[PDB]
Ligand binder design. Sequence first.
Ligand SMILES: OC[C@@H]1[C@@H](O)[C@@H](O)CN1Cc1cccc2cccnc12
Ligand SMILES: OC[C@@H]1[C@@H](O)[C@@H](O)CN1Cc1cccc2cccnc12
Ligand SMILES: [Ca+2]
Ligand SMILES: [Ca+2]
Lengths: 324, 322
Amino acid sequence: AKNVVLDHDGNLDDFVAMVLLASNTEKVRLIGALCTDADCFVENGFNVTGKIMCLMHNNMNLPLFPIGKSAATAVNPFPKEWRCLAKNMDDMPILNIPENVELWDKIKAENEKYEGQQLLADLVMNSEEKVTICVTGPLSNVAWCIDKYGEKFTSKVEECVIMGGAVDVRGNVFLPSTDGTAEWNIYWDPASAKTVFGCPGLRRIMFSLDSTNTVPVRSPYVQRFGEQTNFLLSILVGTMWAMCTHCELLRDGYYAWDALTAAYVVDQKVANVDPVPIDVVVDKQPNEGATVRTDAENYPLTFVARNPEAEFFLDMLLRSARAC
Amino acid sequence: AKNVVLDHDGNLDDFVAMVLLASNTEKVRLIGALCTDADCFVENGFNVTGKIMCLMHNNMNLPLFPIGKSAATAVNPFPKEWRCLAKNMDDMPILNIPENVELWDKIKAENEKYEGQQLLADLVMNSEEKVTICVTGPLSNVAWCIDKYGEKFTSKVEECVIMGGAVDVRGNVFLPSTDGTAEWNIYWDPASAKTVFGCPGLRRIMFSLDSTNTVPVRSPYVQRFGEQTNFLLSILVGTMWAMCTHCEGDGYYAWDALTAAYVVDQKVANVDPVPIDVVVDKQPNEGATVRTDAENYPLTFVARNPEAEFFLDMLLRSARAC
Ligand SMILES: OC[C@@H]1[C@@H](O)[C@@H](O)CN1Cc1cccc2cccnc12
Ligand SMILES: OC[C@@H]1[C@@H](O)[C@@H](O)CN1Cc1cccc2cccnc12
Ligand SMILES: [Ca+2]
Ligand SMILES: [Ca+2]
């Protein structure tokens, strides 16, 4: 098993990613998580992270790990409607079994003292073997680590597997002021994204909308978790996905963005990758936050996922959700 | 037990209402349900109704009953975001257990065949004993039955217990063209509501915002269903309420659940007689329930001072039925 840190922002697929990574102990040793106040309210995202970890700890061989709240602040905040989803999860019966919440109450004081960005730096740099960072929220925390420590940090990173951006497809940031070319995670903090994508000593795997568009969250698949209600993780993952399926009345859509990214960490058969030099628009233009190809000399490459193995991924998630 | 039909529009509390009615078999015999394309997409609301009924049949021996979709159309439709909540429920693991889905698939065609409004008329008029209609969506279906059958329908109704309106508090319909005094269920179809509230020979109990304001859905209580995860209905009820705790006129309350609780046990609230008219003209208070001065106007019993602790305990206990 390789050391993994999950750097997330507490939306529903962030938690599905957490389950995928935590549950696959043969492949992934989850040595820590951090939550960013982006696509969630950080207090809720933090609490749900702990509640999931404690459910799993009490029911399978998952060692406890540190969880930190990131101090990162938004350049462009998410819609408030979307940020509420961690609050809903915090209140779910499946996450509020007394034995699990008793454990969380007991270990919370240790965890709420961590500063998330410093926690990320420390876990990566003090690991004996290299650490893979699965980034499923904005790139603020990795950039912070880069700015503070440079090569002392990046030399200890196995690779960054990042959910973010949109290269040869439309983005998903549709606002009166935007032209729709940007993806949300990058748009939340373009400058941090620019630091990460332009970093010369960092290996990056990028799950942009180019690949994630191929795995929308759809009812017939989600209903399969109903076949598995004896498993706590299937009640958990199925419940989260059920809140993400396409309501027939609506005409933006939900995909397995972060879950696919985590699935790749578990097994790289999930997608092939193409080397692309990725720069980021940081200026306050309609295309702020866009990830664009650059032909600048000596620009570092990023390995952009393509043609993901959707069935393989969907089967992986369903099986992982039977870990307990 | 007394005969009850649930006339609902498929939002989360509509389904909590259904669980309360269905689980309290000592008090309530649920003889049918209707779903209206108001605060849901009716196909989703229909499926969730069936899926809940089938789970409860397999786990607590709840007798199966007809479920019909109403052809009623909106005067003023609900916001689309709010209507999507039944879609989420339709895909919930708890509602998609093979034995329960297999039963639903087996009986779905029979239920698809009903026209919901006619079904409500028939269930009521063909029953040996009188029937209590618990209305948790708009009043379109009760009005349709009144319009078509009149006294032949109303004489078979024990009482209507209705979630709707706002009497001495503001409403919850906040739009550029409104003054905020109307409540959504009435606003969706004011003319139908007027028909119901003005109908003679029909006993009406009214859960307006005056009473329902006392029961906002809040995290501490919701989390208590976590204590009862051995019970399918506690996973079900807890999950639905957990989807409501963030809400922020957008605030979520146990509106329909309190209404159904009263059907189970009238100690949930005392009532006061009020003659209720409904504004139907296209004015800022369109859909408002107001006191009318009309001579010999029929009374409606408006709920007052609900017993919140009693309700909360009832729901936690009902969610242990299976
Ligand atoms: O842009 C995709 C990122 C992913 O990391 C995932 O957590 C959701 N997130 C932002 C996002 C984009 C588009 C639609 C959304 C709807 C609800 C919540 N987040 C959304
Ligand atoms: O006006 C209250 C009625 C109840 O029957 C309940 O099912 C919801 N419904 C409409 C409604 C009103 C106010 C806020 C809401 C938020 C989400 C969904 N419905 C709402
Ligand atoms: Ca995310
Ligand atoms: Ca309703």
